[PDB]
Amino acid sequence: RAEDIHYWLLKSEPHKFSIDDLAKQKTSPWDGVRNYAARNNMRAMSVGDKVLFYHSNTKEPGVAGLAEVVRLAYDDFTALDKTSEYFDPKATKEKNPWKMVDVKFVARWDTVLTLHELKSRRELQKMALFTQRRLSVQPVSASEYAYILRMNEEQQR
Known about the structure:
The chain has 157 residues and is an alpha+beta fold. The protein has 5 helices and 6 strands. A 6-stranded mixed beta sheet has the order 2-5-4-3-1-6.
């Protein structure tokens, strides 16, 4: 398990937080995940794990860049921020179900690798991306990761 690097996809709406926001911040906690399956995926992440930064709910959805996990999951304190969209009325200092990792910027791709293209490769047919819509933190297979990075290179040529 943690001795091997694993791969994930994290969805973010870019008008809220884009790959350029991560780039500017260099590292960021991954706050505001309020789906429990996604939360559990974050508890399964390890330091050094690779991350596809995916822009969702936008004109050009797709993979925008790359990040890397730099801290293991800890309590998502935005659940206690009464001014936050991600406020959870029933979370406590002592009983906060929400957890988050920190990630570091790795790469900002010149143009997004669109969802349409992701759905047009045999190698990607089994991505969770296509199955599971509420799942904002998803496992990516090693081959899926590899194929996607290859696609960015093809697009950049």
